């Protein structure tokens, strides 16, 4: 757990620093320097929107790959003695890959909402552009993380179903239902993302 | 210079591919096709008076392509001679 | 007018409502499914009944979706900071309550499914416990609604 | 360079219709008549759909190609 | 299951049998696969040059087929490729066709008819001068002025898009629409084949509940999308570009009932009413499948004559309806894989060309003619290592996957046994 | 004449009250859940009797919900920074007290249901201990109310 | 006049006095309940006598509650920043001292109940240790009061 | 006009596209390699057949390289913040997609090489999975081509 120790140390140090910094800012009457408005406003909307698109695609692909290998290891381990699995259980893999597809689609649906400003002053950038950036980032986060969790869940269920299939053929048909449920979450994320960027308009 | 027939087959197929595709590329360059404009090694000065300089550069690249086609013809001949040897 | 950055917290509220509820539902479904698949080899006739926990986990996702939709429909580029904070709170509440309920449903469903594989009489008991976990997510939804509509 | 949308559409529609409609009746009778007819009809349908999509995507453009100034300068002289 | 396979159809029969041998006397996907698998591969592997190479390789395998059949070896990969020599031949031919349609040949167009885009009208009718050319790095072109756009290119994509930096902007839309259109049409054909299955097996219950709800749902929801795509292609032009709606937003609004009073206008008069009617029919198709068939089965097999278990029948029908309804959406989404793989192949070929043989072509001195030798070999081997073999394999397997899942799920059951004679 | 971001903290009260409590409850409903399953194989007749821990864990969630709803009904656009801090304090108090009570209830309930399968007399003992754990959450609620109704 | 952020530290003092004391009491109760469940398998008659740890853990929570309520009663709109610091210090002192005391009570009570199953004479000794592990919380309470009532 | 730091993000995108993809490929080329070394002791004839995973891992790297080059050739001195962050998004997309696809390819190939050693029929099966994993990276690349040329 050496790497876990490093991560825990970094996390604890960062958050102890944050606690002490917040205490110092609040107590020394220097709260006006902790402009969260300035951070959210000066930071370009392009950063938020492009991070949103990149996450929408990359986290979806990460979940798809996670599920694909989680279920493919089990498929190819079980198929050594029951090769029929390789034929029937590809559906599990399909579901995992489906996740990634949603990703790209949402990426497109988000990438179509981008447009330059020709402005730098926050009053000039405006509520419309700032909300467009924030909502593209939020939709990217929603789709990417929902797809990540859905892909991992479908992969776990598919590995379970492949291990069950290796011992009784008549079980996969009844375990796929779980995968279907596990797939729905992905769709939900997409829907929410589509609702978040429905009225988004940069320019 | 005897060699394995597999290598001779690969050499002759590559020679045929090179000859055909590089002859076609030379013909298309010599026709001054705009699709290949990005491959022409022109400079800023070439945009001074007219397109004749770019035409000359197209012809030069076509000559390079034909030279490559001839070299691949020689390579294919060598491979065919080796095949006849085997 | 209102601040330029006001919509940020509402956006994050919707994102949290969906993301954390999806995390909870995904964990519940994964744990329940990996318990159900492993049971089925021993007790193949129980799968359908044992699908009940998965459904419960799925419901958690729905809750998130519901609240997310609300926050994604009541969120304009010029909402007051107060409404944006309300939507952020509703989203965090529903998302993290759904996360906790999904973890509880996964654990309880896996354990109860295996026990039912070993003890049919446990089935009803499992359902009760699952409901007690499922209600947790419902609680979050309630609070989320109260915050998002206000 | 006026590419009228009458000769292409008429020519390709009639060609692929003759291949996909008239072709089956000219296939000699034999064990493979059914599979050959299916091949004819499917090729006609798929190829005609692909060509129709390709041509319609270009009909009524909502924006023109973005050409570097070097290639614009060359194309002015070269192309019609 | 016995199919009386032939030498040519053996490859495709083995291809369609890999996912499960068809039941006794059900609609065989082999005859339709024989064409739609090479075609769905060519849509992804669309390239005139790579298609030519594949066709020549497959023709070599076919002509020398007897020799290799006699001279048997243990190479699994070569044996697999050889067994699909006819599959590869058809894939190469269809890839040649699509590469002609894409106007692509080793990442380069052809221009055999002449481009429809003339730059001179920009100088004549437009405001352009040599000053504007000097001042603008990339500029652009507009068809609004009269003589710039002289109609659509008669056959395939216009060559100018190869040299236009706006290439991807147009090609992404064109290929996304093409992928969705082909996918929806393939799925509709599958559903019609399912109707044929039901008619032959004498299952009117499936025909009236099942196939008909399925086709109504698919056509109303997604066939309408193809109609919208074609209509927008035919209707909106450069002059009406400003207010041209986005069919993505319109489809989303149709699903959400979010027809707004602001933003892009309606594609046609009465869009609200027609789209509401289509959506209502689509939702009603769900109860049509779910509630009806279980009730009729229960009525005619447990009230008449008096094991039937209503709860499990209802659950099974609910699972089937959920599967089909989510499958329509997820399959129309998955068919974008065609555009994804086509764009990836095109971009990989473009970068390979511009990174390998642009070195040998972009040399002033005549000595470059020697360099083009070595460079070209690398190009050649790369075009045979990354594009022909690996990208070709990926496109092949993804056309396979589209046939197994997206297409055959509509009508194929695959719960039979291969007929293994003595 | 108050900051427009004052409500933020108050919201983070409500949210927290419903989130942390839920998490705590979940843990309870999780651990006890597993315990019941583990002990249901050999002693089925104790499944319903051994559902007390889950119920207690459920009550913890309710505590949070109550406070959350209370806070969610005390929020206003012009909420002063003082009242917002009061609501944040109440939310944290109830949420984390319920979290600790849920941890204690989960551990005690798992141990007690496992032991009662072997020692019937332990049942009452378990209940007593569970009550004590429950009381912890109650304390939080009390403080929360005192903070949330000033 | 006075800073508006002083009430934040006052409510943090109250919520810390409650939360950390509740966490300590929860840990003590959980460890003691695990020990009691383990012990009672062979020695049922000691299920009640072995509940003293839990009680001694519960007392810790009460300490926190006391301080919390005190702070929740001393809070007002215009507490000087110094008064808010006093309340925060009192809350932290009581909460964390109670947390340490709860850890000690849990460990000592678990060990003592496990040992008393094998050696009755340990009981009295155990009690003493628990007292020595409980006065710690008392000490915190004292300091908190000295800070809270100043 | 534009900030002098606008070119940073795009550059990082390019580097990211090369780095993470390479890492992905590396992991694949490692895991599959290990598997081959484990397989080849008993079934040497399958080395060439079983080298497919590595090749696919290599393909992933190529995708990254492509995007990297596509971004490294488009970085101009006056690169606006819009183009800079478009290239950053493309780089993140391709890099992380290639990383995940390389991990999946490595694990699946390491399993499938050994499986094909045991059961020859699994060979094609392994491939049928690997391509799926591979296209995940491709999907990232696709989005990159959509972004860096928006
Ligand atoms: C160990 C793992 C590796 C590290 C990973 C984590 C990295 C964490 C990142 C740290 C960045 C923190 C932001 C710094 C800016 C804010 C500083 C601040 O609040 O003070 C300035 C603020 C504002 O200052 P000001 O605005 O009056 O100053 C004028 C403005 N400048 C200086 C820019 C011209 O308040 C003060 O003035 C406080 C002065 C005292 C300094 C107190 C700093 C707080 C932390 C001190 C202890 C360290 C904490 C960690 C404990 C040990 C580890 C657990
Ligand atoms: C157990 C841990 C050990 C405790 C110490 C931890 C490390 C903290 C030290 C970090 C280095 C900072 C040293 C001071 C640097 C100079 C700063 C400066 O100029 O100050 C101006 C700041 C800010 O400016 P100002 O307030 O002086 O100016 C007036 C500003 N107006 C008008 C707005 C009010 O104030 C000071 O004068 C601060 C002096 C003392 C700062 C001491 C460090 C702060 C952090 C202490 C730890 C906090 C937790 C305490 C409890 C811990 C218990 C476990
Ligand atoms: C570890 C998990 C997370 C929780 C701990 C860390 C939370 C915060 C981490 C992010 C960095 C720091 C954020 C705060 C920045 C300071 C903002 C500021 O100055 O404005 C304050 C604002 C405004 O300050 P102001 O000076 O503008 O005052 C208002 C004046 N008028 C109205 C005239 C404008 O008010 C507050 O005090 C809000 C409370 C938040 C600030 C305090 C942060 C608390 C940090 C944790 C320690 C809590 C103390 C008790 C410890 C025991 C806990 C149980
Ligand atoms: C110069 C190069 C030009 C490019 C040429 C290469 C193009 C790239 C794409 C080629 C893919 C080839 C695979 C399809 C052909 C096999 C299908 C067929 O008809 O056989 C049925 C095969 C094998 O034939 P079979 O033995 O089952 O035949 C039936 C026999 N009975 C009835 C007795 C059982 O059957 C199946 O298992 C069906 C599923 C096949 C799915 C294909 C999986 C992918 C295979 C990858 C091949 C290797 C990669 C290429 C390596 C090249 C380097 C050497
Ligand atoms: C806990 C006390 C307080 C600590 C406070 C200070 C901050 C934390 C610093 C670490 C303190 C604990 C000591 C840990 C040392 C590093 C981790 C273990 C050793 C190590 O790194 O070696 C291996 C990784 O290789 C490597 O060397 C790779 C590591 C380097 C990677 C750098 C990239 C990360 C940069 C940070 C940003 C990311 C943030 C993510 C949250 C892991 O060893 P093993 O576990 O395999 O073998 C078991 C034994 N080692
Ligand atoms: C016990 C644990 C601790 C709990 C306590 C809460 C801790 C939260 C941490 C965040 C910091 C504390 C929140 C209050 C301080 C906010 C900053 C105030 C400083 C200030 O005056 O800035 C104003 C702008 O900030 C604003 O108005 C910003 C409003 C938004 C503040 C809150 C945002 C925090 C981040 C939340 C992220 C959530 C993510 C969820 C996934 C001025 O602006 P002006 O208009 O006067 O400008 C005039 C320019 N000429
Ligand atoms: C919007 C675009 C999509 C449109 C797609 C649908 C429209 C095209 C298909 C419509 C139906 C065509 C006719 C069906 C067959 C009728 C039977 C007579 C046909 C005929 O003359 O040939 C018989 C052999 O046909 C046979 O053996 C079977 C021929 C089957 C033809 C249809 C197959 C292609 C459909 C797939 C299209 C491509 C995919 C689209 C994405 C000779 O009679 P015989 O003596 O052989 O007796 C029969 C068995 N032996
Ligand atoms: C480049 C642009 C065009 C691209 C798109 C079109 C591509 C068409 C691809 C199909 C053409 C190749 C067909 C295979 C040639 C080899 C023949 C193999 C053996 C053979 O005769 O196969 C028979 C099956 O029918 C057959 O072999 C079928 C032959 C007749 C097919 C008719 C349909 C062709 C496509 C539509 C018309 C052309 C459109 C383009 C102008 C039955 O095997 P056997 O009895 O000989 O076996 C002897 C052992 N039992
Ligand atoms: C096995 C295959 C299964 C089927 C697969 C196909 C998918 C079927 C989808 C559902 C049924 C067909 C589509 C119905 C939705 C409406 C279609 C509108 C098409 C469209 O854009 O046409 C414009 C509207 O037409 C008008 O202005 C006229 C009034 C509005 C349309 C009325 C309904 C037309 C369709 C009739 C039913 C066809 C059924 C096909 C199966 C042309 O109008 P514009 O541009 O000139 O005017 C505009 C200024 N005013
Ligand atoms: C191993 C097996 C063998 C493999 C064989 C592979 C063969 C590949 C050979 C070609 C590769 C290079 C492709 C480049 C294609 C561009 C050439 C091109 O554009 O052609 C046309 C140009 O000449 C004319 O066009 P223009 O002058 O711009 O316009 C004038 C056109 N009007 C007159 C019709 C209006
Ligand atoms: O040309 P352009 O590319 O510039 O834009 P356009 O608008 O003019 O043309 C676009 C034409 C077509 C719409 C382009 C096809 C592109 C697609 C990205 C998505 C296809 C996926 C589908 C239909 C199913 C999955 C869901 C998608 C949004 C979610 C819908 C489902 C629910 C809300 C439940
Ligand atoms: C059984 C249902 C109602 C849910 C279980 C929890 C119930 C009992 C809780 C949840 C929220 C709670 C309410 C929260 C806030 C207030 C405002 C207060 O001034 C009067 C009590 C009242 C109105 C509470 C009554 C009890 C309550 C309704
Ligand atoms: C054993 C019983 C009494 C405790 C269980 C119910 C608890 C939550 C209730 C019962 C009576 C309640 C008190 C009654 C009235 C008030 C006055 C108000 O301004 C602050 C809260 C305060 C001080 C309440 C705190 C919470 C309280 C103690
Ligand atoms: C479980 C029980 C028996 C243990 C003791 C808890 C009760 C009695 C404690 C906890 C909080 C305490 C309160 C804390 C603060 C105040 C305000 C102070 O100015 C006078 C007394 C008063 C009102 C206290 C009375 C006693 C009190 C209510
Ligand atoms: C100037 O430019 C506009 C916009 O492109 C064009 O429509 C118009 O005809 C031009 N007018 C001239 C050259 O007088």
Swiss-Prot record, chains C, F, G, H:
Function: Proton-conducting pore forming subunit of the V0 complex of vacuolar(H+)-ATPase (V-ATPase), a multisubunit enzyme composed of a peripheral complex (V1) that hydrolyzes ATP and a membrane integral complex (V0) that translocates protons. V-ATPase is responsible for acidifying and maintaining the pH of intracellular compartments and in some cell types, is targeted to the plasma membrane, where it is responsible for acidifying the extracellular environment.
Membrane-side (Lumenal) residue stretches: 72-87, 148-150
Family: Belongs to the V-ATPase proteolipid subunit family.
CDD domains according to UniProt: ATP-synt_Vo_c_ATP6C_rpt1, ATP-synt_Vo_c_ATP6C_rpt2
Positions on the Cytoplasmic side per record topology: 29-50, 110-126
Entry membrane topology: Multi-pass membrane protein
Gene source species: Rattus norvegicus (Rat)
Transmembrane segments: 6-28, 51-71, 88-109, 127-147
Assigned GO CC terms: clathrin-coated vesicle membrane; membrane; proton-transporting V-type ATPase complex; synaptic vesicle; synaptic vesicle membrane; vacuolar proton-transporting V-type ATPase, V0 domain
Domain of life per record: Eukaryota
MF terms in GO: proton-transporting ATPase activity, rotational mechanism; ubiquitin protein ligase binding
Tissues where the protein occurs: Expressed in brain (at protein level).
Entry protein name: V-type proton ATPase 16 kDa proteolipid subunit c
Site residues, Essential for proton translocation: 134
UniProtKB/Swiss-Prot annotation, chain D:
Major subcellular location class: membrane
Any GO MF annotation of the entry: proton-transporting ATPase activity, rotational mechanism
Transmembrane segments: 7-27, 35-55
Cytoplasmic compartment spans: 28-34
One GO BP annotation of this record: proton transmembrane transport
One annotated Gene Ontology cellular component of this protein: synaptic vesicle membrane
Record carries keyword Ion transport: yes
Residue numbers on the Lumenal membrane side: 1-6, 56-80
Record localization: Membrane; Cytoplasmic vesicle, Clathrin-coated vesicle membrane; Cytoplasmic vesicle, Secretory vesicle, Synaptic vesicle membrane
Keywords linked to the UniProt accession: Cytoplasmic vesicle, Glycoprotein, Hydrogen ion transport, Ion transport, Membrane, Synapse, Transmembrane, Transmembrane helix, Transport
Keyword set includes Glycoprotein: yes
Organs and tissues of expression: Expressed in brain (at protein level).
Sites where a glycan is attached: 69
Membrane topology annotation: Multi-pass membrane protein
Pfam family, one: ATP_synt_H
Record function comment: Subunit of the V0 complex of vacuolar(H+)-ATPase (V-ATPase), a multisubunit enzyme composed of a peripheral complex (V1) that hydrolyzes ATP and a membrane integral complex (V0) that translocates protons. V-ATPase is responsible for acidifying and maintaining the pH of intracellular compartments and in some cell types, is targeted to the plasma membrane, where it is responsible for acidifying the extracellular environment.
SUBUNIT field: V-ATPase is a heteromultimeric enzyme made up of two complexes: the ATP-hydrolytic V1 complex and the proton translocation V0 complex. The V1 complex consists of three catalytic AB heterodimers that form a heterohexamer, three peripheral stalks each consisting of EG heterodimers, one central rotor including subunits D and F, and the regulatory subunits C and H. The proton translocation complex V0 consists of the proton transport subunit a, a ring of proteolipid subunits c9c'', rotary subunit d, subunits e and f, and the accessory subunits ATP6AP1/Ac45 and ATP6AP2/PRR.
Family: Belongs to the V-ATPase e1/e2 subunit family.
Entry protein name: V-type proton ATPase subunit e 2
Originating organism: Rattus norvegicus
Species lineage: Eukaryota, Metazoa, Chordata, Craniata, Vertebrata
Swiss-Prot record, chain E:
Cytoplasmic compartment segments: 65-79, 194-211
Localization (cell): Cytoplasmic vesicle, Clathrin-coated vesicle membrane; Cytoplasmic vesicle, Secretory vesicle, Synaptic vesicle membrane; Melanosome
Biological process, per Gene Ontology: regulation of macroautophagy; synaptic vesicle lumen acidification; vacuolar acidification
GO molecular function: ATPase binding; proton-transporting ATPase activity, rotational mechanism
Transmembrane parts of this sequence: 27-45, 48-64, 80-109, 174-193, 212-232, 278-297, 322-346, 368-406
Swiss-Prot/TrEMBL keywords: Cytoplasmic vesicle, Hydrogen ion transport, Ion transport, Membrane, Phosphoprotein, Synapse, Transmembrane, Transmembrane helix, Transport
Gene Ontology CC: clathrin-coated vesicle membrane; cytoplasm; melanosome; membrane; perinuclear region of cytoplasm; plasma membrane; synaptic vesicle membrane; terminal bouton
SS bond partners: none
Residue numbers on the Vacuolar membrane side: 46-47, 110-173, 233-277, 347-367
Assembly behavior: V-ATPase is a heteromultimeric enzyme made up of two complexes: the ATP-hydrolytic V1 complex and the proton translocation V0 complex. The V1 complex consists of three catalytic AB heterodimers that form a heterohexamer, three peripheral stalks each consisting of EG heterodimers, one central rotor including subunits D and F, and the regulatory subunits C and H. The proton translocation complex V0 consists of the proton transport subunit a, a ring of proteolipid subunits c9c'', rotary subunit d, subunits e and f, and the accessory subunits ATP6AP1/Ac45 and ATP6AP2/PRR. Interacts with SPAAR.
Protein name per Swiss-Prot or TrEMBL: V-type proton ATPase 116 kDa subunit a 1
